[PDB]
Design a protein around this ligand. Sequence first.
Ligand code: ZN
Ligand code: ZN
Lengths: 98, 72, 148, 116, 49, 46, 147
Amino acid sequence: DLDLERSNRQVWLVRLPMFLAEKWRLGKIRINKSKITLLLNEPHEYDLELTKKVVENEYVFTEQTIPKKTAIVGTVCHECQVMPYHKIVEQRRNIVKE
Amino acid sequence: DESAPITAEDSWAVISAFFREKGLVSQQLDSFNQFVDYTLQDIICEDSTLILEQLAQISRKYEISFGKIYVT
Amino acid sequence: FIKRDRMRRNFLRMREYNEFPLRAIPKEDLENMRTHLLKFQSKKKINPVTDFHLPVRLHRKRKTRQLKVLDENAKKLRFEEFYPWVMEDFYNTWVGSYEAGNSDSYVLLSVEDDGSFTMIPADKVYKFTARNKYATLTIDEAEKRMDK
Amino acid sequence: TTFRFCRDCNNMLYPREDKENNRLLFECRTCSYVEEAGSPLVYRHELITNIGETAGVVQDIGSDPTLPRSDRECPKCHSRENVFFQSQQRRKDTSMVLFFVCLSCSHIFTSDQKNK
Amino acid sequence: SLMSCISVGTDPMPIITFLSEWGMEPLEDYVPHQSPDATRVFVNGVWHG
Amino acid sequence: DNDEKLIIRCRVVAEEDHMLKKIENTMLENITLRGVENIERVVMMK
Amino acid sequence: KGSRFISTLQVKLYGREGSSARTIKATLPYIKQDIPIVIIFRALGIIPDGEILEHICYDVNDWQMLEMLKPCVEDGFVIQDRETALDFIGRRGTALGIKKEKRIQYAKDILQKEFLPHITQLEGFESRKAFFLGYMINRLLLCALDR
Ligand SMILES: [Zn+2]
Ligand SMILES: [Zn+2]
């Protein structure tokens, strides 16, 4: 009984620098009108690049022969990677068995 | 002065400071040392786990693992 | 002309904008559902599933004492899931495949009615073939023809 | 030679003679898609091949330390700072004619005084 | 030769990791026609992007 | 020979192309224009 | 590190220069006969020929390479589907499977594991191996063009 809820929803995909993404495994976005950034809770601000302006054929879904519980989320609207006290993070990046 | 360019004869001083560090037959010693520190631990770790499957009529397992290796 | 060793004597005698907040959803929703990207190989740019028509479905298609060989939990689970899914109307058919390298870092930003967003971590990523377009399945017969 | 691909089949188009209109088309044997030809040309072998001589020119070529430098001025921007190298096609009969690459306009200009 | 030495080798993982963070595009996103001039990147004969 | 561009054109009396492109090879390789086979690079020497 | 692998891949360009229908077939581990490259790509899961050309040749402008591709494209036209390709590869070699249901999975398993033991043996990286293969094909042709 698969059902498309909307697909109308637009989502953006983020490639996030790895340590923060792993930690996630809240902020506030300021959009500058074609340059945009994130004001974090404390901390850094970040710029996010418009990575791919046109993203089509790419949609997001969820789950709940074996058919299973199925629903659609929405469309990938735009592709984005995050860009980045930034001195400390750069130094940690530089630092990067028995 | 300290920042001046260097003459050719100077270069020998470098080479001395090289062999003081390395020694003539060093690659043998360093390669072997790396093998002793890392390879033994990795070889043992890679395939250590072995399990025996025991059947009864209830089925059963036996298992032996290999840990940190010790050298004398 | 000769080699100078008197360097012991020499060295001794010398020395508008808009600010929209972000939030992590209550994990209960996350607990209910895993989220997976969708990608098509079509080259047909549009491909909205609305265009795909309907009805939509999306579904996946005596020994003595002896030895067992060992394996990992994550790999074993992924391997045990080899029935790939698929979708159709009652016909257009897409067949997906685990990207497997891109799990990596993918953070979802859902645009909601208000400019604020919710963000969910991406589970996996899949790549959907558009399959059986010209609809000739020539199979064993095709291989036999090849044997020409 | 510069053959196209089908739509949604993406496969290469094989030329089809139209006997009805006596004109050339392109068929995709996996589907019904056929479109018109843009040229009577179909196949070109080009036995003797002069292309690939200038191959490998890169935006960063001026940064290559292993390449020699020359003082000859460019015909366009008249910049005497340039890097030169021989024909990239590797074959027995390949001529030794140099290709000078300016470091200003990136232009490629040869050293050959016979044919230009 | 006197000053020649033989490499004892290291682990590729930290390097491979380090690349992506500096903007290496992962192989799977590569579209040859669309990004023609990009230099492709090998590590120990394995091509990561 | 007067033509600054040397041109040669040919035609013939069910998938015709492979047959033609086939004939192209016979033209290049399988036609000995003149001279004795197997011989190459005949050098005049005084 | 480990197992001291001898496994070797070869990519062979058939036919002598000047003779048309020079084609490209590739050997695999445990398979008796060489398998054409388009077939290998179909097994990897890339059906459409245009995509395969894109993987092999990275410059749309060069006609020459694309030209020498067409024989391989023709064989690919003969075998048009992924599953059909996997069945074909499995049938071509290692007859101990004896059962079609297991043999196709077995061919896929070989591609994931034994084919190109570097890169990865993990599942889902087929896309990753695909390009590296095309890269080889590129380099080989790029030799046959005397570049
Ligand atoms: Zn088509
Ligand atoms: Zn110039």
